[model samples]
Target: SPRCYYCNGPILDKVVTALDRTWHPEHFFCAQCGAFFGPEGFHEKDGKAYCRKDYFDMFAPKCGGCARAILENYISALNTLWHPECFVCRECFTPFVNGSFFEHDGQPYCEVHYHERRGSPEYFKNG
Candidate 1:
């Protein structure tokens, strides 16, 4: 009785469940490139489906920390992108999850290092 999410047609057979909805085998496809992928290789964003390559190409940002594509939840600071876990203090290399950070020459630093390096009270704080 389930209907395909993409085409809204009855799924008589070859149903692929994804994005919490039922899809026909051919209906489960990338929103960007229209390429088909099985449940395991598909990625979802904003309730729409996409293939791994197309998903990253359409939505992922270039990470400033490692200079790689950021595929998941991330941080944007100093006009650059970073993975949440990769944003760290430039001096001590300490990962920053919260609290204050400083941007110096296009790198992120923790409160302690920021104060040490710049000796200024002006810094970016996050919670």
Candidate 2:
């Protein structure tokens, strides 16, 4: 039997081992929402426990284009988070091949689209 981490009292019954410590099964719970963790387990942060939804909603960055949770490597443009697949021209939804882009209206745009959106489209041809 080990001492319960929560109550700091002796445990004579079931003890759950987690976070490198012992906890009474009933005392092991999430730090947020004051709810018991389900079979899916929990996430740890700042030496505290948090349920999955709370942890992700509290810390995960969301995509700016499609507006979804972002966990993989994403692109940083227009001062917002965007997945590589979603970071396309705002007007034409075209992917920039050379990573070259123009900025307007607090968003990203291709050179052609940028000029078109700006007004009086002009073409620069090298003779």
Candidate 3:
């Protein structure tokens, strides 16, 4: 629970490293910006740093599956940001919040999973 007033690079790095050594430190991203802060340092996309909330407003329909606060830009294959346990299916990488999504052979899946399970020919159903 470090406050923003002291959450700078050096301190942040120490925290990230220490946490990585302790728990799922990798799970932490900017709760505000969604910027991926790694054990060594923060992830730089384009030129600026971003956390989840920083960019979620740009997207639409929110996320099809999960409660993650991110830009609904309709980016393809967005599951990379999700916890590995939340991965949609072997095919599309979407995230599912809550337990609404189903699992197949140990794989957590999104709505697309139902279609895939049924062998639906259509993929990428208009977000």
Candidate 4:
């Protein structure tokens, strides 16, 4: 007999497997919204299951660049939310997947524009 991960009871019928665990069909529910979901339609976070909309709405942050919800993976910089691809230099739109960037006016800039905008010798020397 398989045990339900959610209720810790025996799965008599209609076993639903998700998050690498077995569940009763009715027991598999979104932790945030309390909605029931099939294994393929749900998302897991922190060992709890959630429906797609509730997962994003409750746990994901909005991208600062596109004003859209950042899902799955993201970059936290400038004290703001950004998708991995959206975290780019504001001046040239260069993706900051690697290398360095500078912040100005609460936005990120590449090294070139960062130097151009603030030409202080200390900016280059200290950073």
Give the best candidate by lDDT. 2
lDDT of 1 by residue, 15-124 (tens): 77776778888756566667553436566788877665556457567764476767677676754567766666645676755655467667777766655666545654
Cα RMSD for candidates in order: 12.3, 13.2, 12.4, 11.9
> What is the alpha-carbon RMSD of candidate 2 to the true structure?
13.2
Candidate with top TM-score is 2
Question: Which residue pairs show backbone clashes in model 1?
Answer: none
- Estimate, for each residue in 34-79, the C-alpha lDDT of model 4 and write its tens digit: 7553435666788887666556557567765487766777666654
Pull out the clashing pairs in model 2.
Answer: none
Write down the TM-score of every candidate.
0.40, 0.42, 0.23, 0.40
Q: Which candidate, 2 or 4, has the higher TM-score?
A: 2
How far in Å is the alpha carbon of 22 misplaced in model 4?
0.9
Better of 1 and 2 by lDDT: 2
Candidate lDDT (C-alpha), each: 0.65, 0.67, 0.45, 0.66
Give the residue spans of candidate 4 off by over 4 A: 37-39, 59-127
Model with the higher TM-score, candidate 1 or 2: 2
